[PDB]
Design a protein around this ligand. Structure first.
Ligand code: NA
Length: 129
């Protein structure tokens, strides 16, 4: 599913991402924009052979099982395919564990390089939340 910006903002808020670990909704929407362009079906192979899955491009190296990432963990205890669903519940639940891991949203290199310190509130502008 390719979410609308305000559609994804509402979904993330409903699943309690708005100000989760101190990160306002616009940070999460910004990260999803540059990670996935709001496409739940987005997959991207990393140089280390791991893969990134879904709206928040969650890595099989640590967080989900895809069966093809030697020496990896599955700390969200989910098949990586569950992160491609039109229902973002598994992506959000897993993202809450990632952002709690100690480096906050710096875990998302695209957030650090493209969202951090910017006017992230722009991403929820016009939305009825
Ligand atoms: Na894994």
């Amino acid at each position: 599913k390719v979410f609308g910006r305000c559609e994804l903002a509402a979904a993330m808020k409903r699943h309690g991402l708005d100000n989760y670990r101190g990160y306002s909704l616009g940070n999460w929407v910004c990260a999803a924009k540059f990670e996935s362009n709001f496409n739940t079906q987005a997959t991207n192979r990393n140089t280390d052979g791991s893969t990134d899955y879904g709206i928040l491009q969650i890595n099989s190296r640590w967080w989900c099982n895809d069966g093809r990432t030697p020496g990896s963990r599955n700390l969200c205890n989910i098949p990586c395919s569950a992160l491609l669903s039109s229902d973002i519940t598994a992506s959000v639940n897993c993202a809450k564990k990632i952002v709690s891991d100690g480096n906050g949203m710096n875990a998302w290199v695209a957030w650090r390089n493209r969202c951090k310190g910017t006017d992230v509130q722009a991403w929820i502008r016009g939305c009825r939340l």
